[PDB]
Amino acid sequence: MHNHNNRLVITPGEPAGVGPDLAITLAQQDWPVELVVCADPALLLARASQLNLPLQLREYQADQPAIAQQAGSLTILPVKTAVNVVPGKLDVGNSHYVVETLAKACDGAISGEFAALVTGPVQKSIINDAGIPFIGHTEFFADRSHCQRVVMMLATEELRVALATTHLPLLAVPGAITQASLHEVITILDNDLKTKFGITQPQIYVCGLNPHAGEGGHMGHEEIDTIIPALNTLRQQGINLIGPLPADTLFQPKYLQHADAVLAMYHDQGLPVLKYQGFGRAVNITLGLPFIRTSVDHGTALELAATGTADVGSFITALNLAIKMINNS
Amino acid sequence: MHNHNNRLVITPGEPAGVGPDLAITLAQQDWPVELVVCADPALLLARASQLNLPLQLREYQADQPAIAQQAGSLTILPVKTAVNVVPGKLDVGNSHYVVETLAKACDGAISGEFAALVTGPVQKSIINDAGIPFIGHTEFFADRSHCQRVVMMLATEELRVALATTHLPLLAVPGAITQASLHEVITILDNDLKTKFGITQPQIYVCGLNPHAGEGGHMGHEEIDTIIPALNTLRQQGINLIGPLPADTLFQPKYLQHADAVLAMYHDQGLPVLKYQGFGRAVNITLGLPFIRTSVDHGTALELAATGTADVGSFITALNLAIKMINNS
Ligand SMILES: OC[C@H]1O[C@@](CO)(O[C@H]2O[C@H](CO)[C@@H](O)[C@H](O)[C@H]2O)[C@@H](O)[C@@H]1O
Ligand SMILES: OC[C@H]1O[C@@](CO)(O[C@H]2O[C@H](CO)[C@@H](O)[C@H](O)[C@H]2O)[C@@H](O)[C@@H]1O
Ligand code: NI
Numbered sequence: 001m002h003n004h005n006n007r008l009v010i011t012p013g014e015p016a017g018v019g020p021d022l023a024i025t026l027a028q029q030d031w032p033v034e035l036v037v038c039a040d041p042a043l044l045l046a047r048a049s050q051l052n053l054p055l056q057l058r059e060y061q062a063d064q065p066a067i068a069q070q071a072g073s074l075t076i077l078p079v080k081t082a083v084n085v086v087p088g089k090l091d092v093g094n095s096h097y098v099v100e101t102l103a104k105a106c107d108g109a110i111s112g113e114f115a116a117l118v119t120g121p122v123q124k125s126i127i128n129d130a131g132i133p134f135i136g137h138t139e140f141f142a143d144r145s146h147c148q149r150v151v152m153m154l155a156t157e158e159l160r161v162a163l164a165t166t167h168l169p170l171l172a173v174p175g176a177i178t179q180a181s182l183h184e185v186i187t188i189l190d191n192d193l194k195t196k197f198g199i200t201q202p203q204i205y206v207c208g209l210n211p212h213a214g215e216g217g218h219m220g221h222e223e224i225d226t227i228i229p230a231l232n233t234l235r236q237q238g239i240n241l242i243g244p245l246p247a248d249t250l251f252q253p254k255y256l257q258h259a260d261a262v263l264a265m266y267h268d269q270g271l272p273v274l275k276y277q278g279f280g281r282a283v284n285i286t287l288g289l290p291f292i293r294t295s296v297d298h299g300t301a302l303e304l305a306a307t308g309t310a311d312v313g314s315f316i317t318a319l320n321l322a323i324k325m326i327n328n329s
Numbered sequence: 330m331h332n333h334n335n336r337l338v339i340t341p342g343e344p345a346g347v348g349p350d351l352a353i354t355l356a357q358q359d360w361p362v363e364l365v366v367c368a369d370p371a372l373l374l375a376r377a378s379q380l381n382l383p384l385q386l387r388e389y390q391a392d393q394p395a396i397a398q399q400a401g402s403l404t405i406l407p408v409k410t411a412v413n414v415v416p417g418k419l420d421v422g423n424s425h426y427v428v429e430t431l432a433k434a435c436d437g438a439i440s441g442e443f444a445a446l447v448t449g450p451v452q453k454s455i456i457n458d459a460g461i462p463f464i465g466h467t468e469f470f471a472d473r474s475h476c477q478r479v480v481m482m483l484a485t486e487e488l489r490v491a492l493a494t495t496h497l498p499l500l501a502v503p504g505a506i507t508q509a510s511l512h513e514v515i516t517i518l519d520n521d522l523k524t525k526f527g528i529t530q531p532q533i534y535v536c537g538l539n540p541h542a543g544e545g546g547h548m549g550h551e552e553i554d555t556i557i558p559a560l561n562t563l564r565q566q567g568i569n570l571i572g573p574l575p576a577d578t579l580f581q582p583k584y585l586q587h588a589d590a591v592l593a594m595y596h597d598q599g600l601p602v603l604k605y606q607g608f609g610r611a612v613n614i615t616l617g618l619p620f621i622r623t624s625v626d627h628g629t630a631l632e633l634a635a636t637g638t639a640d641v642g643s644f645i646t647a648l649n650l651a652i653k654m655i656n657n658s
């Protein structure tokens with residue numbers, strides 16, 4: 001989107017989970033944008049009561065100017081649960097409700113009614129148990145957006161890793177890396193660093209696939225046959241790319257500090273460092289969608305729902321990042 | 330070895346490299362053990378001159394009591410270079426000398442003449458160019474020790490990762506993990522944590538091979554078919570093992586803090602986090618050898634030889650770890 005307004009939509013997600021707690025907790029401070037929470041209002045107020053935190057919900061008025069959200073409030077875009085919610089207890093009765101809040105939030109983000117979509121956790125199993133096709137937010141938003149390719153990034157305030165491949169068995173990773181696949185992934189990554197993170201000339205640092213980036217062909221051939229040629233084609237199109245580098249070189253701070261994003265070839269090459277340094281404030285950012293979407297990188301934490309022990313760090317950081325992307329855009 | 334004396338052998342390694350600088354720099358403080366440096370004495374004194382640091386070499390007297398090394402000195406076990414050494418310039422003429430210092434140091438560590446072997450960097454190419462079979466210190470010491478299996482560990486003062494597999498292309502990793510291979514690797518790892526690190530009941534935490542440790546068979550089958558059964562056999566023999574866990578769970582500090590060592594299944598699953606947090610003070614420790622051996626985790630840094638800019642952190646930490654292993658043993 002070339003223009004962004006001053007309203008963000010938040011879906012708390014699974015009502016039995018901690019998303020509601022976390023939304024209510026986020027709401028105890030002032031924000032520079034309007035926080036439009038798509039959720040059941042009774043739930044939020046009752047969860048706020050269970051946690052002993054105050055909360056006033058303001059009706060969402062689409063035709064009004066955004067009002068920067070004030071401490072002790074949220075702006076509600078009300079959607080009703082079908083059944084009573086009991087914290088910690090999944091109930092198939094409320095899955096239509098969860099997915100409805102996603103649909104609404106996604107439709108808004110698409111049109112630009114909402115400047116960014118920030119998501120709390122949902123539970124795939126209970127959604128499926130209600131007969132609704134669902135894997136994650138990513139596929140639901142991609143399909144509803146008619147978005148043909150997305151790229152996963154995990155990011156903290158200080159470090160961004162994107163993945164060339166995601167939830168594949170290790171056996172399948174080398175075959176899944178092609179020149180075509182890397183072309184698509186890096187184009188999206190470079191495009192969003194510019195358009196979403198507002199970095200005019202992103203420096204993207206790339207991991208080899210093999211240990212020591214293949215050590216001259218002595219420890220694998222994928223760097224020579226596939227990665228290097230793909231990067232060179234992209235550099236011809238103007239994308240600033242350094243690598244491929246050994247992962248255990250690149251992930252030293254002395255080099256990391258130079259990267260705007262790192263592209264890991266596979267899940268466990270990239271995520272461990274981020275989680276190590278993340279202090280539980282890591283944020284999932286879905287690239288390639290036609291709008292800004294950030295997310296918590298934890299689950300529903302059902303056992304912690306309504307306890308006051310759920311950590312708000314991921315959600316606060318997700319919302320913080322969203323807001324910078326709205327602006328640095 | 331059931332008993333350790335108060336003498337450590339240091340091989341500075343490649344004379345044209347930074348190993349000599351680093352040895353001379355280590356020597357500017359007091360140590361609780363005797364530091365027997367197997368190297369050319371003219372080289373060390375000349376490198377000390379180039380770096381403007383003082384240095385007195387004490388002749389090594391095997392039949393005397395160890396004397397705790399004093400600041401401004403080393404104990405020399407002299408071995409002559411064949412040709413003049415020029416910092417930064419590899420010379421095939423001196424490779425026989427490098428390998429001779431390794432042989433001597435290794436023979437001593439074997440017999441218990443030396444309580445631990447700590448190695449500076451060597452350069453494989455120049456050793457090979459002189460017609461001498463060489464890959465690394467590890468294979469040279471393993472073969473000379475008649476040691477049938479070694480396990481690589483990278484460790485800092487705060488975190489230890491061992492690897493189930495090392496310098497293999499990613500394609501080869503899943504096939505290289507067997508019940509047999511994991512049995513051998515974990516036996517060695519557990520044995521050395523007890524005998525070398527002095528941890529009576531090591532808690533070893535194990536990564537799955539696949540992302541999310543295979544997610545119940547939905548993201549790979551190796552955890553179910555191979556890893557889990559291997560760990561259960563080992564737990565029957567009394568080895569305390571937690572996992573397999575997702576790498577991007579396990580490498581969070583909140584869980585790491587509980588592990589005495591982490592076993593990563595492959596190189597890039599384990600090393601990046603260690604290097605990230607290592608601040609360049611990471612130490613390679615070779616497990617399974619019949620003596621304690623620690624090492625720098627950097628190369629010869631030829632361009633930095635005699636500049637005073639080479640970082641001593643890895644070497645200081647390597648020597649520090651060696652000394653604790655001598656004692657905690
Ligand atoms: O040993 C590293 C190995 O990685 C490659 C890429 O596959 O090169 C990387 O490392 C080089 C420094 O060792 C850099 O000059 C290069 O730009 C970087 O891509 C291989 O060529 C090399 O053998
Ligand atoms: O999703 C994790 C995945 O890993 C396995 C091992 O392959 O189990 C690990 O994680 C469980 C918690 O989710 C622990 O109970 C277990 O001890 C640990 O090994 C799989 O069983 C699971 O599907
Ligand atoms: Ni994942």
Ligand code: NI
Nearest residue numbers: 211212496596
């Ligand atoms: Ni390596």
